[PDB]
Amino acid sequence: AETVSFSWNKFVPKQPNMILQGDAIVTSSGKLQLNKVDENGTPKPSSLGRALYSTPIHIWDKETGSVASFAASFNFTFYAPDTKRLADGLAFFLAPIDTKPQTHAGYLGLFNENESGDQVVAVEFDTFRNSWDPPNPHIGINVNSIRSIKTTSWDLANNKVAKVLITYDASTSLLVASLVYPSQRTSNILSDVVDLKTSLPEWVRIGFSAATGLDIPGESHDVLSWSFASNLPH
Amino acid sequence: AETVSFSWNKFVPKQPNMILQGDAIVTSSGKLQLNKVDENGTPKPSSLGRALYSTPIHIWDKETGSVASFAASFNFTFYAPDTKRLADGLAFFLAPIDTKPQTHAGYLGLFNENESGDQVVAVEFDTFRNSWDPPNPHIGINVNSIRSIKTTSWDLANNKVAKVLITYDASTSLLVASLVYPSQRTSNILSDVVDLKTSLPEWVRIGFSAATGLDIPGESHDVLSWSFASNLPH
Amino acid sequence: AETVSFSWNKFVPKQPNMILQGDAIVTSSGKLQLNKVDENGTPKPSSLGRALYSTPIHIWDKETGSVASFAASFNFTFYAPDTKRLADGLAFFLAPIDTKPQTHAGYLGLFNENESGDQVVAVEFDTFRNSWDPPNPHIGINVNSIRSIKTTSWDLANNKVAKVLITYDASTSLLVASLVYPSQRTSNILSDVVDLKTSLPEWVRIGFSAATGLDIPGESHDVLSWSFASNLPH
Amino acid sequence: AETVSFSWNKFVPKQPNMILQGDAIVTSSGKLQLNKVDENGTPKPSSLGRALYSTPIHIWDKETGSVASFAASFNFTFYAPDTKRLADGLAFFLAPIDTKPQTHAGYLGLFNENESGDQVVAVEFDTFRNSWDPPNPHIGINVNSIRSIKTTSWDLANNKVAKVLITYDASTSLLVASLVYPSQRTSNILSDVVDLKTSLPEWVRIGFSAATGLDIPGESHDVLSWSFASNLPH
Ligand SMILES: [Ca+2]
Ligand SMILES: [Ca+2]
Ligand SMILES: [Ca+2]
Ligand SMILES: [Ca+2]
Ligand SMILES: [Mn+2]
Ligand SMILES: [Mn+2]
Ligand SMILES: [Mn+2]
Ligand SMILES: [Mn+2]
């Protein structure tokens, strides 16, 4: 086997094991703040921040044919000055080692209009209905496209902390995404199969991406903690 | 801290670390078969089997005031000769060290008519609507009563294997129960708060209980694997 | 695979997951005190206490032929009113589920004069030279006999805490025993091969045994903490 | 807490999570070969290869004052065409993020003549007696100096695989280094206290360094596997 793991209950500014892109920064308060915010703490429209764990992960082996199973968890929140006008969302994803930020707003920094997507697999938390979207805030599974292969309703709550759990079982190629609000005693879950061998390169970096509304502030997105474990078998 | 854990991908007949009650047995095939079955593999009505992990778990400390966080997973299935007439269900639970089987059928071997329940906490997978029940097969959280404190719809499927995950976070006293059918790419999740300090004794045994229909065969219930981890803090 | 593990930084009187034999007790102070002691804290000669983890461990599989790898750690100490007259020692061991205390003093509660030993594997910390012994306090590897298959010098220290680590690698059948005194910055290590398949039953209980001098007080032995992990492969 | 871990039973050429310096390469055979070798497999004198795990480790916190505990293991070997003329050795170490190779031969690529050492902590396996050295191959604990704070005899064996275990317990600041030859059923152990807070920077990279004899071939050094875990407390 080949394994890797990590856990933090907080971020540390300038931590050398995280790559930051876009507007993403880490506050003295230990928060990974993905989007730029006004004085009064008001998200600025057209913000785009990404953050990637520095060490590349070995996700599958062309030689042995093995695919890793993995699991990630995190806590996050968003703040919306106007609960009625949200945009655009947050995503957890896997991409090529040299991944750079893509289009903002509704493309969540991952993808691009008029272009087939890099090899990017993501789990989205989407607040804004684009043409390709279902109605309402949803959770989705994106496989090389911002046009989700499967979705589900996300009972979101402004300013409350959401506890997220993502899991991938190589044995069934089944990806599971669950989200829970302890404050609310509320919960959501989504699942589908994903072939990692056909959607990602052998080695990838994993991380976060979030965007504020194109022309509106939408909501800011902050990640509070992060945990992650991968097991690639012999 | 104080921890304990275990994992098996199969059961072994006569394994000395499992307590069996009722009709529960372990097949040569490595299945923990909770209910008695006809020649043709047809569940017998009024069957009741329970099985408990032999070592008692330390769930909370009256001295320090600490409460354990824990997590359990398992795979299970049921077989119903007649999909239209199911009964009664299966449960995962925690009870006092000296726990014995209670009433069958709709009481899931856990509880009793006309009696306040021992200190029993359970997560149920309920196939039969009793008076106290909501309509349809559901998943529930029972806290000393068969009358669930909270429920959710269970998209079940005859003969398919369900992958279950139960979690308890002392920090928020939030219990989470999730169930997934990889065959179906289908999933369900439930959550609520439970005060272990007021609902269980310091030490408990954890295990399985299932019942077939009172006067009908309902469905049989088999557990295939079991994993479990507890962490009681200083 | 099949795994089990546990960890405690202290013992709790009456803990239901420990079996006590002989004079062994657990103090309110969280110490597993193996031998009986005078008012003034003076060991009584001919004391014999054993303690076993309640759940039986699956050490090897006659069917699959697999053997578990495992690891145990603990902290312990002894007190000797007279450093010049020590006896007899302490042992960590594995034995049959129904193991009962054997001969005391130099037999460490494990074995018997004039009898071939049950299926008992042990790692000893031996303070008293019996006929079969090398000179000086030593650490040994006993395989069904109190006459160690291999030994090494133990730089012991009265009243100081020793940190012990025992490991078993099925892949090489190599058992490793290491002991460290942080106070002293001193350390000792021993290793040899042991065939578990030929020296123990499939299932065993693991635990501690200690004896005070036959006609002298020797030293008392206390275990402070215990950790343990086993992995039996498919 | 803050943790990180990893395990590999083999290296993969071009793996993106390892930094290679000097002559270090990874063979198709999955071996991390630290030193350059003739056609016939004969070490070339004045070889110097280092290899570092790419992600920086958080070893202590100036803010909280906490220091990590950690553990590393590995398998390694050396080949000596002439068992009577060995040089110079291998080391496991921790250094600053931007660590570069230093002096070769007896300086093990870590240090320099006439210079006080960077903040480098190491555990050495030393085959050649330099002026500062004790007689015979030894294991040592180097703290900012190639002049070991403590040493012990190393019962080495040409061409056999050694299994190494290094541990650091913040609670006692005690570093433990153990080495075992299963082929030989032979073992060695060393321990001393090390103040990480005064000998390393908060963040470091960990890795391997080995050197062949100045003017002689000495022995080659190959690392076969690597495991590592760190836990930095709140
Ligand atoms: Ca959208
Ligand atoms: Ca019911
Ligand atoms: Ca003796
Ligand atoms: Ca030297
Ligand atoms: Mn969407
Ligand atoms: Mn119900
Ligand atoms: Mn002896
Ligand atoms: Mn040296």
Side-chain angles (χ1 to χ4, degrees), chain A residues 1-6 8 11 13 15-17 19-30 32-35 37 41-43 45-54 56-61 65 67-83 86-112 114-115 117 119-128 130-146 148-162 164-182 184 186-196 198-233, chain B residues 1-6 8 11 13 15-17 19-30 32-35 37 41-43 45-54 56-61 65 67-83 86-112 114-115 117 119-128 130-146 148-162 164-182 184 186-196 198-233, chain C residues 1-6 8 11 13 15-17 19-30 32-35 37 41-43 45-54 56-61 65 67-83 86-112 114-115 117 119-128 130-146 148-162 164-182 184 186-196 198-233, chain D residues 1-6 8 11 13 15-17 19-30 32-35 37 41-43 45-54 56-61 65 67-83 86-112 114-115 117 119-128 130-146 148-162 164-182 184 186-196 198-233:
Chain A
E2 155 176 11
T3 63
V4 60
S5 56
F6 71 83
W8 331 314
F11 296 84
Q15 61 191 109
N17 60 352
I19 295 167
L20 298 182
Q21 343 173 294
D23 307 329
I25 67 114
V26 19
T27 77
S28 51
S29 58
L32 158 64
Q33 159 196 336
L34 291 167
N35 303 107
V37 160
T42 283
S46 281
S47 198
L48 170 73
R50 308 199 322 169
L52 324 142
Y53 185 60
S54 67
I57 321 291
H58 206 197
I59 273 290
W60 69 272
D61 196 329
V67 179
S69 298
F70 69 77
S73 53
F74 52 100
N75 294 354
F76 86 90
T77 76
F78 61 96
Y79 156 91
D82 157 24
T83 47
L86 301 172
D88 272 286
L90 174 116
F92 179 73
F93 70 105
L94 317 77
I97 277 357
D98 63 318
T99 179
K100 317 248 175 259
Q102 308 317 283
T103 304
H104 68 283
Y107 286 111
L108 299 178
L110 304 164
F111 304 108
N112 301 289
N114 303 330
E115 270 181 75
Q119 331 164 69
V120 178
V121 174
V123 178
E124 80 169 31
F125 301 92
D126 182 352
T127 55
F128 189 79
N130 313 84
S131 17
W132 53 84
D133 280 310
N136 330 299
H138 51 285
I139 303 185
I141 300 199
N142 303 179
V143 176
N144 302 155
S145 169
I146 206 266
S148 314
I149 59 142
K150 157 127 90 149
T151 74
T152 213
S153 36
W154 169 21
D155 304 309
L156 75 213
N158 191 37
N159 273 308
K160 312 285 170 166
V161 179
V164 170
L165 179 71
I166 301 156
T167 67
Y168 189 73
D169 170 9
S171 93
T172 60
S173 321
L174 190 69
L175 174 42
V176 181
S178 100
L179 173 171
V180 154
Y181 287 107
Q184 289 349 274
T186 228
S187 76
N188 301 145
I189 191 176
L190 184 57
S191 73
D192 212 347
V193 329
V194 182
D195 177 4
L196 301 186
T198 69
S199 17
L200 309 164
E202 246 181 287
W203 294 88
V204 291
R205 289 221 236 243
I206 58 162
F208 311 97
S209 197
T212 61
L214 200 17
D215 50 353
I216 80 204
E219 76 285 333
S220 68
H221 318 77
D222 300 357
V223 177
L224 310 180
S225 72
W226 196 7
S227 168
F228 178 80
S230 197
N231 183 309
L232 180 85
Chain B
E2 155 176 11
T3 63
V4 60
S5 56
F6 71 83
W8 331 314
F11 296 84
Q15 61 191 109
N17 60 352
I19 295 167
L20 298 182
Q21 343 173 294
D23 307 329
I25 67 114
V26 19
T27 77
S28 51
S29 58
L32 158 64
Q33 159 196 336
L34 291 167
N35 303 107
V37 160
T42 283
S46 281
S47 198
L48 170 73
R50 308 199 322 169
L52 324 142
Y53 185 60
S54 67
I57 321 291
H58 206 197
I59 273 290
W60 69 272
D61 196 329
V67 179
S69 298
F70 69 77
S73 53
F74 52 100
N75 294 354
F76 86 90
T77 76
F78 61 96
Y79 156 91
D82 157 24
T83 47
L86 301 172
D88 272 286
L90 174 116
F92 179 73
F93 70 105
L94 317 77
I97 277 357
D98 63 318
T99 179
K100 317 248 175 259
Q102 308 317 283
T103 304
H104 68 283
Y107 286 111
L108 299 178
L110 304 164
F111 304 108
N112 301 289
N114 303 330
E115 270 181 75
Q119 331 164 69
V120 178
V121 174
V123 178
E124 80 169 31
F125 301 92
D126 182 352
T127 55
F128 189 79
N130 313 84
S131 17
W132 53 84
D133 280 310
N136 330 299
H138 51 285
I139 303 185
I141 300 199
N142 303 179
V143 176
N144 302 155
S145 169
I146 206 266
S148 314
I149 59 142
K150 157 127 90 149
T151 74
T152 213
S153 36
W154 169 21
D155 304 309
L156 75 213
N158 191 37
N159 273 308
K160 312 285 170 166
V161 179
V164 170
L165 179 71
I166 301 156
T167 67
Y168 189 73
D169 170 9
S171 93
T172 60
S173 321
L174 190 69
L175 174 42
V176 181
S178 100
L179 173 171
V180 154
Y181 287 107
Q184 289 349 274
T186 228
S187 76
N188 301 145
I189 191 176
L190 184 57
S191 73
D192 212 347
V193 329
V194 182
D195 177 4
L196 301 186
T198 69
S199 17
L200 309 164
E202 246 181 287
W203 294 88
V204 291
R205 289 221 236 243
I206 58 162
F208 311 97
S209 197
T212 61
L214 200 17
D215 50 353
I216 80 204
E219 76 285 333
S220 68
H221 318 77
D222 300 357
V223 177
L224 310 180
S225 72
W226 196 7
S227 168
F228 178 80
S230 197
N231 183 309
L232 180 85
Chain C
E2 155 176 11
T3 63
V4 60
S5 56
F6 71 83
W8 331 314
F11 296 84
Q15 61 191 109
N17 60 352
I19 295 167
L20 298 182
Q21 343 173 294
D23 307 329
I25 67 114
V26 19
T27 77
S28 51
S29 58
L32 158 64
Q33 159 196 336
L34 291 167
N35 303 107
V37 160
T42 283
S46 281
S47 198
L48 170 73
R50 308 199 322 169
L52 324 142
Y53 185 60
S54 67
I57 321 291
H58 206 197
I59 273 290
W60 69 272
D61 196 329
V67 179
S69 298
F70 69 77
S73 53
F74 52 100
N75 294 354
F76 86 90
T77 76
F78 61 96
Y79 156 91
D82 157 24
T83 47
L86 301 172
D88 272 286
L90 174 116
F92 179 73
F93 70 105
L94 317 77
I97 277 357
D98 63 318
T99 179
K100 317 248 175 259
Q102 308 317 283
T103 304
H104 68 283
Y107 286 111
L108 299 178
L110 304 164
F111 304 108
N112 301 289
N114 303 330
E115 270 181 75
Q119 331 164 69
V120 178
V121 174
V123 178
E124 80 169 31
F125 301 92
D126 182 352
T127 55
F128 189 79
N130 313 84
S131 17
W132 53 84
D133 280 310
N136 330 299
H138 51 285
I139 303 185
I141 300 199
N142 303 179
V143 176
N144 302 155
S145 169
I146 206 266
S148 314
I149 59 142
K150 157 127 90 149
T151 74
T152 213
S153 36
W154 169 21
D155 304 309
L156 75 213
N158 191 37
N159 273 308
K160 312 285 170 166
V161 179
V164 170
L165 179 71
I166 301 156
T167 67
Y168 189 73
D169 170 9
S171 93
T172 60
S173 321
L174 190 69
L175 174 42
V176 181
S178 100
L179 173 171
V180 154
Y181 287 107
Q184 289 349 274
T186 228
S187 76
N188 301 145
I189 191 176
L190 184 57
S191 73
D192 212 347
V193 329
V194 182
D195 177 4
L196 301 186
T198 69
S199 17
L200 309 164
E202 246 181 287
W203 294 88
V204 291
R205 289 221 236 243
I206 58 162
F208 311 97
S209 197
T212 61
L214 200 17
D215 50 353
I216 80 204
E219 76 285 333
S220 68
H221 318 77
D222 300 357
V223 177
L224 310 180
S225 72
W226 196 7
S227 168
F228 178 80
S230 197
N231 183 309
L232 180 85
Chain D
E2 155 176 11
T3 63
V4 60
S5 56
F6 71 83
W8 331 314
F11 296 84
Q15 61 191 109
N17 60 352
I19 295 167
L20 298 182
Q21 343 173 294
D23 307 329
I25 67 114
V26 19
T27 77
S28 51
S29 58
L32 158 64
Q33 159 196 336
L34 291 167
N35 303 107
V37 160
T42 283
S46 281
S47 198
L48 170 73
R50 308 199 322 169
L52 324 142
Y53 185 60
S54 67
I57 321 291
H58 206 197
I59 273 290
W60 69 272
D61 196 329
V67 179
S69 298
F70 69 77
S73 53
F74 52 100
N75 294 354
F76 86 90
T77 76
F78 61 96
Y79 156 91
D82 157 24
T83 47
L86 301 172
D88 272 286
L90 174 116
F92 179 73
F93 70 105
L94 317 77
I97 277 357
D98 63 318
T99 179
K100 317 248 175 259
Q102 308 317 283
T103 304
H104 68 283
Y107 286 111
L108 299 178
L110 304 164
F111 304 108
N112 301 289
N114 303 330
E115 270 181 75
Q119 331 164 69
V120 178
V121 174
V123 178
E124 80 169 31
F125 301 92
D126 182 352
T127 55
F128 189 79
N130 313 84
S131 17
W132 53 84
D133 280 310
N136 330 299
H138 51 285
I139 303 185
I141 300 199
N142 303 179
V143 176
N144 302 155
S145 169
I146 206 266
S148 314
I149 59 142
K150 157 127 90 149
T151 74
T152 213
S153 36
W154 169 21
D155 304 309
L156 75 213
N158 191 37
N159 273 308
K160 312 285 170 166
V161 179
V164 170
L165 179 71
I166 301 156
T167 67
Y168 189 73
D169 170 9
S171 93
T172 60
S173 321
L174 190 69
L175 174 42
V176 181
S178 100
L179 173 171
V180 154
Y181 287 107
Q184 289 349 274
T186 228
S187 76
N188 301 145
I189 191 176
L190 184 57
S191 73
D192 212 347
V193 329
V194 182
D195 177 4
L196 301 186
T198 69
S199 17
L200 309 164
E202 246 181 287
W203 294 88
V204 291
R205 289 221 236 243
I206 58 162
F208 311 97
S209 197
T212 61
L214 200 17
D215 50 353
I216 80 204
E219 76 285 333
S220 68
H221 318 77
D222 300 357
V223 177
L224 310 180
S225 72
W226 196 7
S227 168
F228 178 80
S230 197
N231 183 309
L232 180 85

